[PDB]
Amino acid sequence: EFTVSTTEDLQRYRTECVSSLNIPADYVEKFKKWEFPEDDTTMCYIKCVFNKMQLFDDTEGPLVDNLVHQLAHGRDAEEVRTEVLKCVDKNTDNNACHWAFRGFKCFQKNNLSLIKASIKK
C-alpha cells in the first residue's frame, strides 16, 4: 500500500535529495526551516521529496489518492479530495520540477499541509 509520511520521513528524504541533487549548503539551511525560494534548485528539490513521499510522479503528475491520505489527517476525505483536485493540472511547460512545485504552491494557497501535528486519545 501507501503509507503517510512523518517528520522523520521528511528528514530522511531531505538528506537523500540533498545528496542526490548536490544542493548548495545555503539552500539546506533554508530547507531545514521549510523555507522554499521559487527557483529551479528548490523546484527540483520539491519534486524529489514528493517523489519519495509518493505524492507526485513525473509522468502521472500529483497522486490524488495518496495526497488525500496525507493531507486529510482524519478530516473528511471528500472535502479534501475537492480541494486537492482544484490544485491538479497538466504538465503544461513539459517540466516535471515546475509541475510538482506548482502543486505545492497551490496546496500552500489552499492551506493544505503535508506535515501537521496530531492529537491522539
Side-chain angles (χ1 to χ4, degrees), residues 2-78 80-89 91-119:
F2 151 97
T3 72
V4 149
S5 282
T6 78
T7 53
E8 272 170 31
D9 301 308
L10 180 52
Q11 201 276 347
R12 181 167 83 258
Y13 300 152
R14 184 217 312 142
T15 280
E16 301 176 352
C17 295
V18 153
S19 151
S20 79
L21 285 166
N22 297 313
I23 300 294
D26 79 84
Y27 279 102
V28 176
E29 261 311 301
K30 285 152 155 215
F31 298 170
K32 270 204 71 202
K33 292 194 287 196
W34 296 7
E35 281 170 27
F36 303 109
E38 283 222 41
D39 62 19
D40 289 291
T41 304
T42 305
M43 290 184 188
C44 287
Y45 171 80
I46 292 304
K47 195 192 65 78
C48 180
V49 168
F50 287 10
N51 285 156
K52 284 168 182 301
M53 293 175 72
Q54 290 167 280
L55 297 186
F56 178 94
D57 175 88
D58 292 10
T59 290
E60 300 291 342
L63 302 177
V64 171
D65 285 350
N66 300 349
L67 279 162
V68 166
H69 282 134
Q70 178 79 34
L71 303 170
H73 316 276
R75 180 160 150 229
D76 164 58
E78 296 159 7
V80 177
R81 194 180 294 269
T82 283
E83 285 202 277
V84 165
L85 286 170
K86 277 162 51 193
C87 284
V88 175
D89 68 343
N91 188 11
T92 54
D93 69 350
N94 192 246
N95 184 326
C97 292
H98 292 195
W99 198 10
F101 195 82
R102 202 159 58 247
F104 178 46
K105 216 188 175 209
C106 175
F107 304 153
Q108 290 305 286
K109 200 213 265 283
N110 281 250
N111 196 61
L112 289 168
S113 289
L114 296 178
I115 302 291
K116 262 204 63 189
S118 149
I119 297 174

